[PDB]
Design goal:
The structure is a homodimer.
Chain A: E1 2-8, H1 11-14, H2 17-29, E2 32-36, E3 39-41, H3 43-54, E4 60-62, E5 75-80, E6 83-88, H4 94-105, E7 111-117, H5 130-142, E8 150-156, E9 163-172, E10 175-188, E11 192-195
Parallel strand pairs in A: 2-9, 6-7, 7-8
Antiparallel strand pairs in A: 1-8, 2-3, 4-5, 5-6, 9-10, 10-11
PDB class: hydrolase
Keywords: restriction enzyme, hydrolase
Assembly: dimeric
Chain lengths: ~200, ~200
């Protein structure tokens, strides 16, 4: 996928280039994961993909307790050396969520990378999106509310362009994949995901 | 105008019925104030109307310093006895704005009334709206973040219904009214304000 980046409190000069590269390379070669709602962004598939890539690179992971069993895996955290990676795709309250995480951060870790998906992707209801997270952080930054270094990453794709897509069907009850296919497609014109 | 109300921390049992009545009666007989952007919600006209009604009823007022001269008057505060009324129509960061106001509130006032306008009204860019403020407060309430009693009020109008409208044109430079008319209209189908 493609990515848009917003750095706060000079996360760019603080971040270990190699640690950032591991995250960046993983995201760039990663296809768009989608599932039925028709086709919507699949955060669990996405986090599973990220996890399988970073675990072998020695990133320690932790999966936050979901407000709903079938939501488990919608958000995931990774840590390595002094870097914290927080994938936030759920509808958990953004500012409150991070204010709470910020507290622990200040009580070691020196920079945090937050991964979100662009608004262009149709998704679960009220689920966080990049532009919204950026707006909120731009606002706090404006009044010097926080000093923690943050690299905010937005997962996006260009419109009307052939891309690799992974379509999955889950039997959410224990979660199971009953069907999956790796096809080609693109996003039309929020956007609409089209498969070939 | 019509109003929708959401109470937090039992603002409803704490609020002086007469103090609430002064606020409620003012809002109910108040027409929809609009101006050119075509026609959009006019917060200054609205606050001027509210101010002219409450000052004679002994509500002390205070107008917050705007982040922009021509924005001055977009938000206004009123106090009387133990009640705080905060009209919030601007794009100032909601949670941060109120967290800061909350701090002073806890350092007397016993309940706060926050007035916003519904999402149905086309308005200034990124300006706060009722449904958004409610979502954010519902979220903080969910995790017992604040205990301050709040009555959140949303200014709305029914669709396809004849209503009184005040259309104004300002020479924003010192603010001046160069043109104004009191007509009839309605909101079609965000919504679109139509005048007759």
């Amino acid at each position: 996928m493609k990515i848009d980046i917003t750095d706060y409190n000079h996360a760019d000069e603080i971040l270990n280039p190699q640690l950032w590269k591991e995250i960046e390379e993983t995201l760039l070669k990663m296809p768009l994961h989608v599932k039925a709602s028709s086709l919507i962004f699949d955060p669990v598939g996405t986090n599973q993909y990220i996890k399988d890539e970073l675990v072998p690179k020695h990133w320690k992971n932790n999966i936050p307790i979901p407000k709903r069993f079938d939501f488990l895996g919608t958000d995931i955290d990774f840590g390595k050396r002094d870097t914290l990676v927080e994938v936030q795709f759920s509808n958990y309250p953004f500012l409150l969520n991070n204010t709470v995480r910020s507290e622990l951060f200040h009580k070691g870790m020196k920079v945090a990378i937050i991964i979100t998906k662009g608004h262009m992707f149709p998704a679960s209801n009220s689920s966080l999106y990049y532009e919204q997270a950026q707006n909120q952080l731009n606002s706090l930054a404006e009044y010097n509310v926080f000093d923690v270094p943050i690299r905010l990453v937005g997962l996006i794709e260009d419109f009307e362009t052939d891309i690799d897509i992974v379509s999955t069907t889950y039997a959410d009850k224990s979660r199971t994949i009953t069907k999956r296919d790796t096809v080609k497609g693109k996003v039309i014109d929020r956007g609409t995901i089209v498969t070939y």
